[PDB]
Design an enzyme around this catalytic site. Structure first.
Site, mmCIF file in Angstrom:
data_model
loop_
_atom_site.group_PDB
_atom_site.id
_atom_site.type_symbol
_atom_site.label_atom_id
_atom_site.label_comp_id
_atom_site.label_asym_id
_atom_site.label_seq_id
_atom_site.Cartn_x
_atom_site.Cartn_y
_atom_site.Cartn_z
ATOM 1 N N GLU A 35 19.688 -6.986 8.969
ATOM 2 C CA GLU A 35 18.484 -7.156 9.824
ATOM 3 C C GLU A 35 18.626 -6.388 11.114
ATOM 4 O O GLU A 35 17.723 -5.644 11.516
ATOM 5 C CB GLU A 35 18.268 -8.610 10.091
ATOM 6 C CG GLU A 35 17.760 -9.337 8.835
ATOM 7 C CD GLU A 35 16.332 -8.937 8.360
ATOM 8 O OE1 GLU A 35 15.666 -8.071 8.980
ATOM 9 O OE2 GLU A 35 15.903 -9.461 7.321
ATOM 10 N N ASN A 46 6.414 -4.265 12.570
ATOM 11 C CA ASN A 46 5.975 -4.405 11.159
ATOM 12 C C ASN A 46 4.630 -3.690 11.012
ATOM 13 O O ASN A 46 3.852 -3.507 11.971
ATOM 14 C CB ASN A 46 5.849 -5.889 10.782
ATOM 15 C CG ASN A 46 7.156 -6.641 10.941
ATOM 16 O OD1 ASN A 46 8.222 -6.089 10.612
ATOM 17 N ND2 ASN A 46 7.104 -7.836 11.488
ATOM 18 N N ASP A 48 1.866 -4.768 9.923
ATOM 19 C CA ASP A 48 0.753 -5.586 10.297
ATOM 20 C C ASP A 48 0.557 -5.719 11.818
ATOM 21 O O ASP A 48 -0.324 -6.484 12.248
ATOM 22 C CB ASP A 48 0.835 -6.944 9.575
ATOM 23 C CG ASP A 48 1.953 -7.853 10.100
ATOM 24 O OD1 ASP A 48 2.717 -7.457 10.995
ATOM 25 O OD2 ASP A 48 2.050 -8.981 9.642
ATOM 26 N N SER A 50 2.807 -7.130 13.836
ATOM 27 C CA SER A 50 3.742 -8.137 14.311
ATOM 28 C C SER A 50 5.020 -7.355 14.594
ATOM 29 O O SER A 50 5.135 -6.208 14.232
ATOM 30 C CB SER A 50 4.002 -9.246 13.288
ATOM 31 O OG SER A 50 4.579 -8.724 12.127
ATOM 32 N N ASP A 52 9.484 -7.940 14.739
ATOM 33 C CA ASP A 52 10.697 -8.730 14.477
ATOM 34 C C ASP A 52 11.666 -8.568 15.659
ATOM 35 O O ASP A 52 11.891 -7.451 16.164
ATOM 36 C CB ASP A 52 11.423 -8.219 13.232
ATOM 37 C CG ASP A 52 10.780 -8.691 11.918
ATOM 38 O OD1 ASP A 52 9.774 -9.449 11.993
ATOM 39 O OD2 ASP A 52 11.257 -8.217 10.823
ATOM 40 N N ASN A 59 10.081 -12.922 13.222
ATOM 41 C CA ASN A 59 8.881 -12.128 13.373
ATOM 42 C C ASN A 59 7.721 -12.962 13.970
ATOM 43 O O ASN A 59 7.420 -14.065 13.556
ATOM 44 C CB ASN A 59 8.555 -11.280 12.130
ATOM 45 C CG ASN A 59 7.552 -11.913 11.240
ATOM 46 O OD1 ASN A 59 7.454 -13.164 11.194
ATOM 47 N ND2 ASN A 59 6.802 -11.083 10.487
ATOM 48 N N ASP A 101 11.739 -24.053 5.518
ATOM 49 C CA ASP A 101 10.245 -24.075 5.392
ATOM 50 C C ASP A 101 9.729 -23.932 3.960
ATOM 51 O O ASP A 101 8.515 -23.929 3.735
ATOM 52 C CB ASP A 101 9.599 -23.040 6.357
ATOM 53 C CG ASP A 101 9.270 -21.683 5.703
ATOM 54 O OD1 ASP A 101 9.921 -21.315 4.670
ATOM 55 O OD2 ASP A 101 8.314 -21.011 6.216
#
Ligand SMILES: [Cl-]
Ligand SMILES: [Cl-]
Ligand SMILES: [Cl-]
Ligand SMILES: [Cl-]
Ligand SMILES: [Cl-]
Ligand code: NA
Ligand SMILES: [Pt+2]
Length: 129
Positions: A35, A46, A48, A50, A52, A59, A101
């Protein structure tokens, strides 16, 4: 901060990630490697819009607030900049919520593609834990 591999394993252990939701320490170290290359200051945008943040590339789409991710949530209730500290406390606390989650560590794309199913214990080999 750029952690050393055993240095990071130690900090993660101290913060209770070793076997958290059943994921051994080497899983978390391997995820961190791929990562962020163990760099707490790592940021990556990202597709979209967003971003990280940090050692585990948390993110802003869901987990932290950066003020520039429309429609997003902040489920860890933290500024995304808190995820870039030399101290990993905030990143670990938020990772605990992520991995609880429903999809476990598959939420980390680099974990799924680069760590999952591999000899992750190699990542903690030789460390004094
Ligand atoms: Cl392990
Ligand atoms: Cl936002
Ligand atoms: Cl904030
Ligand atoms: Cl730390
Ligand atoms: Cl799981
Ligand atoms: Na957000
Ligand atoms: Pt902690």
């Amino acid at each position: 901060k750029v952690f050393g591999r055993c240095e990071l394993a130690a900090a993660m252990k101290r913060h209770g990630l070793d076997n958290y939701r059943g994921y051994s320490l080497g899983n978390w170290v391997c995820a961190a490697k791929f990562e962020s290359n163990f760099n707490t200051q790592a940021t990556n945008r990202n597709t979209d819009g967003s971003t990280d943040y940090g050692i585990l590339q948390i993110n802003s789409r869901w987990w932290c607030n950066d003020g520039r991710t429309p429609g997003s949530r902040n489920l860890c209730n933290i500024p995304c900049s808190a995820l870039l500290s030399s101290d990993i406390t905030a990143s670990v606390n938020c990772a605990k919520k992520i991995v609880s989650d429903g999809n476990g560590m598959n939420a980390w794309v680099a974990w799924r593609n680069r760590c999952k199913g591999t000899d992750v214990q190699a990542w903690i080999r030789g460390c004094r834990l």
